[PDB]
Amino acid sequence: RGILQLFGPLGLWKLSTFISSKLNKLVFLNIGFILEIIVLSWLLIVFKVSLLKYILLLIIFIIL
Amino acid sequence: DHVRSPNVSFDDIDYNNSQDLHNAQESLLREQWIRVSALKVCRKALESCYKTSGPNHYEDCREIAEKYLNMLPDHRIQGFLGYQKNDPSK
Amino acid sequence: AFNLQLEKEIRSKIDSLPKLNNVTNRKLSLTDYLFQNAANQALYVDNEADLKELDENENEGWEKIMYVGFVPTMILIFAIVLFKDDKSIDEWAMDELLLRLKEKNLSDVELIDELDKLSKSHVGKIGASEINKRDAVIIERILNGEYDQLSGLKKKEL
Amino acid sequence: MLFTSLLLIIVYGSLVNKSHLLTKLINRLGLIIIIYTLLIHLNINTLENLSIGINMFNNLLLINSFNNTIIELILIICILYVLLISFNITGLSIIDNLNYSKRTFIVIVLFNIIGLTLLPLVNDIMILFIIIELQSYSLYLLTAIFNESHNSTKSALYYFIVGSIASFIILDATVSIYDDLGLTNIQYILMYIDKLEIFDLLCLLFGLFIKIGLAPFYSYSITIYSLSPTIITNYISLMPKLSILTLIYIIMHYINIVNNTDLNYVISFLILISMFIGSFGGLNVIRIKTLLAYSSLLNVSYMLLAILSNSNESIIAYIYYIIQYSLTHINIFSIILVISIYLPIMNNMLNVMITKYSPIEYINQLKNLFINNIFIAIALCISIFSLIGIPPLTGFYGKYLVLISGLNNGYVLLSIVLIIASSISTVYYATILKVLSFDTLSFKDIISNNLIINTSPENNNNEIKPEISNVISYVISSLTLIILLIIIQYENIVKGAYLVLLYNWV
Amino acid sequence: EQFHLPQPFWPTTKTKEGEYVPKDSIREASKVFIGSGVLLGGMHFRRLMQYKKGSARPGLAKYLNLFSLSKSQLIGFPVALGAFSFLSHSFANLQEGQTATGEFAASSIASLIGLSIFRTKKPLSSNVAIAVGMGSLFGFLTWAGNFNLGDNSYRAALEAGNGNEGGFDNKVIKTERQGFWEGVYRRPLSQTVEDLGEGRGIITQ
Amino acid sequence: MLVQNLIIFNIIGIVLLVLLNNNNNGILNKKSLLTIKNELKLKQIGLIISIINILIIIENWIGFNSNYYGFQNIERFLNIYWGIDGISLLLVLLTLILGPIAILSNWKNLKGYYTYYVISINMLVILMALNFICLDLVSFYILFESTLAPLFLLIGIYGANNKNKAAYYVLIYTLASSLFMLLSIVIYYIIINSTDYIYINNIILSINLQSLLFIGIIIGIAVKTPLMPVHTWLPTVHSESPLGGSILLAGVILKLAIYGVIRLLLPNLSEISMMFTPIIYIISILTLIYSSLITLKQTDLKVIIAYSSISHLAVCMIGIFANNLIGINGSLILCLAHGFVSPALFILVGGILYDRYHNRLINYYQGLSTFMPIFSIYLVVFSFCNTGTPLSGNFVGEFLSITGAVIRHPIIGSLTAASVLLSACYQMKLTNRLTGSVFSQYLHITNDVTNREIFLLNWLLIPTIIIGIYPSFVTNILNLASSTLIYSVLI
Ligand SMILES: CCCCCCCCCCCCCCCCCC(=O)OC[C@H](COP(=O)(O)OCCN)OC(=O)CCCCCCCCCCCCCCCCC
Ligand SMILES: CCCCCCCCCCCCCCCCCC(=O)OC[C@H](COP(=O)(O)OCCN)OC(=O)CCCCCCCCCCCCCCCCC
Ligand SMILES: CCCCCCCCCCCCCCCCCC(=O)OC[C@H](COP(=O)(O)OCCN)OC(=O)CCCCCCCCCCCCCCCCC
Ligand SMILES: CCCCCCCCCCCCCCCCCC(=O)OC[C@H](COP(=O)(O)OCCN)OC(=O)CCCCCCCCCCCCCCCCC
């Protein structure tokens, strides 16, 4: 009833609720929001590919 | 009737022959079960010698007991996968 | 055997008691559940609910199937494990061992005498038992040489 | 045939008077046009002849056996979609009259089908830009066909703005390539595949990724699919993906010639993020179309892994997956349109407002479907289990074939992540099934005369009145049994996908 | 004698001894740290302009609040990314190559350093729990071969003859170990003893 | 002949029950005639179908040769090769015998929808039975996971108060873990171009690749036995699932994991299985010891039995990973013996007590022997079978499994003997309480075991004791099939 729930249903439910609540705030009809994300993605073309894992770490920081 | 073991070794066949590899696998299995049959017969002799000899069993059954203790480690089923997948000489 | 005239008697009598919750000569057949008119099927249930309403753990409808289909099936399974002419590998190997003893010792007067008189039913009963049989020479010959051919299949050494 | 018959329908629709019956009969003429288009296309295009790849119209177009299969798939799915507007989906006028109130509905579909079928064939940068505009403009006009609807117009505004930004990105990529090489034909550009900047083609793919709703550009498609009418959302969420993904496969086929692993890593980054968003995004949602929008984002990520690997095993994976996913998409939306007839009627907390465009808008409006219609509820369960990937349904072989191509190319991470993504998304797929069936016994003996279906009259009380119309019922029956019983013909179907070649030859 | 444990690791090209010129860890971390701080700080002052241009429009304000970064995040993010780049290169130089253990250590420490800056108002054990989770993800990323196995994939092996295109033959026995993606019919018994060791049925009983 | 008839006949049975019971849905509002007596006729047809499935495997058993090496009855159907050996034959018969028992256990304790339940039971039985006769990895996975669709709906519709929790647990624990097993199957099909049993058994893969493939498969197997620490789904699923669902889950579904080791690990990944055996033994030993001590503190009757099943299946895992015939035969006999005793204990605990009092809390029951003497006899008899008392098939399975572990690993395999003590600690703590002291003050005196519940208990007890006294009925069939799994090169 302890660690196997934290690393199981109860723990993953809290993780899912936290992550899904973040994603629910990103779906709203707004021109400025989607334009910023489109233009931001252009940096993947500019950046050298070795920086992908740093962008991955930065994105996980923003989830918090 | 009484079927017989098709004596066929892994060393004399091409494994790409499906029926030939099947025979070598069966051939190795049947020779191990016979050794199990022989071991049980030897153990039958040991039990009868022990019962009859009474206090003389140490001397009377000495060579039967010695043979059973030698055959016991290897007169058991070992499978065919071990020798099929391994070449001892390499 | 729907017998619609019989239901009308059954339906009417339950009407003689307006109060609720305060026959053995009835049966149905297999062809009735699919061919009766929609009106008659309604009547049968209206009685069955009310007949049951006017009421231990028997006649539940499974006894015939399990005691005609299932128990004979287990009996047949019991028969197969008992009286099926199937050799196992261990039983085959003992027969093969006795056969090779005969072939290696054809010139043996004593051994072949015991092998011929050793019946097929006592092949697995070799040793000390209630059966009075002579296998002393048979056991003697197995203890002497090795009648397996495992060394002939491993042609590669270290 | 499409172009010629479209002109006649355009003029004919403006000549006759406006009535719901006439618009419905004009829609049936559109059904005949697509059927004749399919028959003519089948009569002349064959897989064996198109294996080499045949140029048409001064090499502006290039059709091969890989392009041809997608064109026939587009025509077949478009046939199934037109049955929705050409026949009764529910049989009740308050719901069905919407599909007959716009006479230009069928005209826009025929406009878009032309754009859908020509896009995979593009062989020049000038015609690539022209066709991608033709497909996009028709999608905007279809998203705004119901111009008296506030949400429908708002979606079309969002669709236009985002899709114009992507088109500019696509145009900017082709202009950069023309600036580098001074050439416009794709086969001419292939001669200089080693000298042009390959990331100029990644910019071209980025504009295509926006138009398929890939992450991080997923936000607008999730918003648009939920706000649009269910009949509109059924089309726009599937049709653009059939053509654009096929075009992405052909572009990635040319990109793999130079083997730029940096480009492979950026795309893998977009696939990885889309799996995370597609699975975790749908966990906390209450709208069914919002849930299906994330399902679409997730299944696109699965296909893009096959497109990214881009090998012989990828042709079989992509071709089979796109066919079976289209049928599952069609089957689910057909059931959702039908089952609005089982909605309870008032005679209140949360002040829930339901409109005529989307009568089924929340997942919990599917409650007690196991009681109202067991056969339809099972049909919906089979489709949802296929999306989950329960064998031996079609959805299992789709994931199995995608994994084979992905793992054969060394995409260990993406193969593991998608299988984790499949498990996470199973949570919200199961929630549909929980709503359909789990309260069956505690509700079986209840009196429900307050349904939408109960408002319909009865003819004679001596006849048998079917509760669902003939055509829509047969389509749901056919697609559900295909999804269920694909094991019977799976071996023969996958042998056909072996023959579909994209310059393999030998 | 060493324990004979299974080794579930995907194939990777192994640099020969004397190879692997190391990468300058400070220089590489400097580019990530400076470039990130310039962008994050620059995008911060760009968004303040968008604030001043409009603050009576709720639609713009809602979208700007999502992308807004706190002051401790504008400093913590470049520091965490810079420490990650430094520690990833520093450990890679130590081990003559990149390993999943090195990336697990580099990511968790970089996360914990950043978390202790922009997540000050949370318990210390909470920050460590996230750092262990973040470090495991990047260790798993390296274990799976980053985004693709590349030259170690089966498709690459099949093109180099190291696959199983020609099939198998038991008469052929190879002293050297088979390739990662290669399967054989029969193996030298010495290889089995090297893998499993003697004992419970190998050679002896 | 076997697979083709077993599938075609059951499809006709499924369609027949649907046609009869759904012909009157169309606003007839009638009273029908098959709906009487809780759909008695529709229940009886499904009960007959289950028994006929047992007759089909028998016709192919009469021709089975116990002295033939290899798969028999080799058949092609739906582009899939189907075959049977000694190991598969016994597991198929065990699976089909439990079919009628699952239906009869829920003969009159469902709130409704009897046709749906009977179809799902017959559908679960055939899919599990077909899983023992497939001959390739992909066909193994298709049948391994196909049972999730009906099982998920069976729990959620016919389950207890926490059925929603249990339905999600079984769907997500098993599907997520099996997808890792699918990854290993995809790798086999990529590098060898086939998933056939015989084809892949002859190929030796690199010791590093064998490790990755073993871990992928073992993840799917370890969750479904289940083993620690991925066992937490089972107690929740067993306490909420219907009685027939618990019988099939505790009788067949868990045995597919042992058969997974026999097919997917031992003959194809032989070299890496020897490397992993100490890890397997440590995990299984701690699974056995931990589950036994945890079972002591449980307060739910159906959860106590669920944890008892985990302890014995750890012993089955230990035996099957012994590299000798004694352990392999012992693990297989213990699988069959458990396949009868464990469903019987669920009938006593969750089928007789629950159908009378509708409460599974331990604190309500004591002194049952005063007014339920027949229940106490069967409860006591099956309790001693469950702890491996001699004369029961459980002991023969347990003793050979423990002996096989000792022969395989004398030091750590000796810890397996704690099954003898620990199993009796929690099982006889529960039985000593149900049959001890004064009849409970929280219970009203009611009927004892009925004829149907006597029938179920007798025909689960009878096979356990026949196997316990004369296991050679089973060992003769398994002898040649089990000997092929041993890997060793003695010089
Ligand atoms: C033997 C069984 C084995 C099976 C088990 C396998 C699962 C093991 C994983 C266990 C980890 C999850 C369980 C614990 C998570 C608990 C989440 C949580 O409590 O929220 C923490 C915090 C929000 O704070 P709050 O919850 O409100 O209060 C603090 C309570 N002390 O918010 C947080 O800090 C959460 C962290 C932010 C999210 C980080 C996201 C990282 C990337 C996602 C992780 C999964 C990646 C999957 C990738 C593929 C997805 C398609
Ligand atoms: C007179 C001055 C003129 C200044 C012009 C630049 C304007 C200010 C912008 C700040 C600088 C960032 C952009 C720098 C150029 C783009 C990156 C690049 O190309 O690499 C250059 C730099 C040095 O790398 P170098 O090895 O010298 O280049 C290859 C040589 N063979 O590589 C780097 O290390 C750059 C640092 C990048 C790492 C930080 C970015 C990642 C973290 C922030 C993420 C931003 C948001 C995420 C966007 C993606 C969203 C999906
Ligand atoms: C320079 C500007 C900032 C950079 C933005 C980058 C945008 C494109 C990157 C791809 C992510 C697309 C998702 C939509 C973009 C998110 C827009 C955004 O930045 O808003 C921040 C959002 C809101 O969070 P909140 O803290 O509540 O708001 C701030 C309050 N002041 O917080 C979020 O929820 C953002 C996280 C969204 C989920 C993305 C997760 C993608 C998967 C990452 C893990 C990958 C899984 C595999 C891991 C194993 C490998 C290590
Ligand atoms: C509560 C549930 C109700 C059920 C409870 C009681 C269960 C039934 C008890 C019996 C269990 C079934 C096992 C017996 C079935 C017959 C087994 C058999 O086939 O015996 C064959 C035996 C040797 O075989 P063979 O030499 O090859 O000759 C026959 C060729 N067909 O040939 C023979 O010599 C046959 C000898 C049979 C002897 C009678 C066996 C009955 C049991 C008595 C002995 C039990 C063992 C002693 C235990 C005492 C306590 C320690």
Ligand SMILES: CCCCCCCCCCCC(=O)OC[C@H](COP(=O)(O)OCC[N+](C)(C)C)OC(=O)CCCCCCCCCCC
């Ligand atoms: C890989 C090694 C083998 C592991 C096999 C898979 C086990 C997954 C964990 C069980 C989850 C479960 O069962 O999901 C069911 C649970 C039910 O939660 P509940 O009890 O109703 O509490 C929740 C409600 N409360 C707290 C209010 C009472 O939904 C969840 O929590 C939703 C989160 C879903 C996450 C699923 C991701 C799966 C990833 C698998 C690989 C890491």
Ligand SMILES: CCCCCCCCCCCC(=O)OC[C@H](COP(=O)(O)OCC[N+](C)(C)C)OC(=O)CCCCCCCCCCC
């Ligand atoms: C071996 C392969 C077989 C494949 C065919 C499956 C059965 C098809 C049933 C369609 C007809 C139907 O929906 O009918 C409904 C029937 C019977 O319900 P009822 O109690 O009469 O309904 C109530 C009517 N009253 C109110 C008049 C009494 O439910 C079934 O049959 C259920 C079986 C399917 C459950 C599991 C679904 C899993 C989906 C994914 C599978 C991999």
